[PDB]
Amino acid sequence: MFKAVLFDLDGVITDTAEYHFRAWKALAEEIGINGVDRQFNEQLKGVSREDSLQKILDLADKKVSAEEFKELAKRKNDNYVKMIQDVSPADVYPGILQLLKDLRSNKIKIALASASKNGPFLLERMNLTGYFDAIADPAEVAASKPAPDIFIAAAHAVGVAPSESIGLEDSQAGIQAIKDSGALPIGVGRPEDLGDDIVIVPDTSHYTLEFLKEVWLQKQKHHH
Numbered sequence: 001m002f003k004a005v006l007f008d009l010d011g012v013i014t015d016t017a018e019y020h021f022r023a024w025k026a027l028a029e030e031i032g033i034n035g036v037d038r039q040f041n042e043q044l045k046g047v048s049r050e051d052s053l054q055k056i057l058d059l060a061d062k063k064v065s066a067e068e069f070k071e072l073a074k075r076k077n078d079n080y081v082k083m084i085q086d087v088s089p090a091d092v093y094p095g096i097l098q099l100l101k102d103l104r105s106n107k108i109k110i111a112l113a114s115a116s117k118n119g120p121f122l123l124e125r126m127n128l129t130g131y132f133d134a135i136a137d138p139a140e141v142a143a144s145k146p147a148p149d150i151f152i153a154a155a156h157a158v159g160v161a162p163s164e165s166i167g168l169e170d171s172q173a174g175i176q177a178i179k180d181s182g183a184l185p186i187g188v189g190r191p192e193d194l195g196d197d198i199v200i201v202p203d204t205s206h207y208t209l210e211f212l213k214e215v216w217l218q219k220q221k222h223h224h
């Protein structure tokens with residue numbers, strides 16, 4: 001039986017897409033740039049802060065010094081970190097809270113493998129910290145997804161082998177990081193985005209303890 005489940009945060013437990021979009025829009029109006037609307041926001045999602053700020057600059061071909069650039073990126077981040085004060089347990093995606101309870105009560109290790117420096121805060125906003133045995137610190141991990149280190153550190157932090165672990169992710173880079181760590185990925189999303197090879201469910205309500213056991217047992221049979 002698997003001994004740990006390794007959770008990404010964004011797109012598995014919740015998302016904060018409205019908060020990012022609000023923060024980006026506030027930043028762009030402050031610097032008198034227009035055209036950061038919802039369709040344009042689709043380009044910012046999941047992208048690094050620096051690349052998103054560059055996309056917003058190119059809307060006006062505005063050029064800035066490196067200190068201004070760093071200042072603008074921090075301004076958006078400070079504003080977003082203030083906005084996620086309002087995250088609450090009602091933001092947890094369907095199926096997730098019950099899955100965490102079932103793992104905890106089954107004594108299966110639960111770890112967070114998220115790139116976000118806001119992971120601890122967001123889990124506390126959602127009243128989930130009690131379920132998480134460890135949170136891999138993204139600052140301590142030099143190589144980010146699709147490199148497997150964040151997931152390797154997550155498995156180690158709870159004292160299980162990655163090969164004893166299932167990883168949950170909604171992004172291709174995360175699915176690849178889970179693969180390369182040796183844990184077993186179960187994607188949530190579409191195979192057009194995540195690949196035709198892994199086990200995939202369309203939405204998080206499929207993430208049940210019973211379904212993960214089905215995927216695990218079926219992986220153990222594959223030998224052979």
Ligand SMILES: [Ca+2]
Nearest residue numbers: 008010011171
């Ligand atoms: Ca993700």
Ligand SMILES: [Ca+2]
Nearest residue numbers: 011015170189
């Ligand atoms: Ca999504």
Ligand SMILES: [Ca+2]
Nearest residue numbers: 089090092097
């Ligand atoms: Ca909840």
Ligand SMILES: [Ca+2]
Nearest residue numbers: 124125126127
């Ligand atoms: Ca709380």
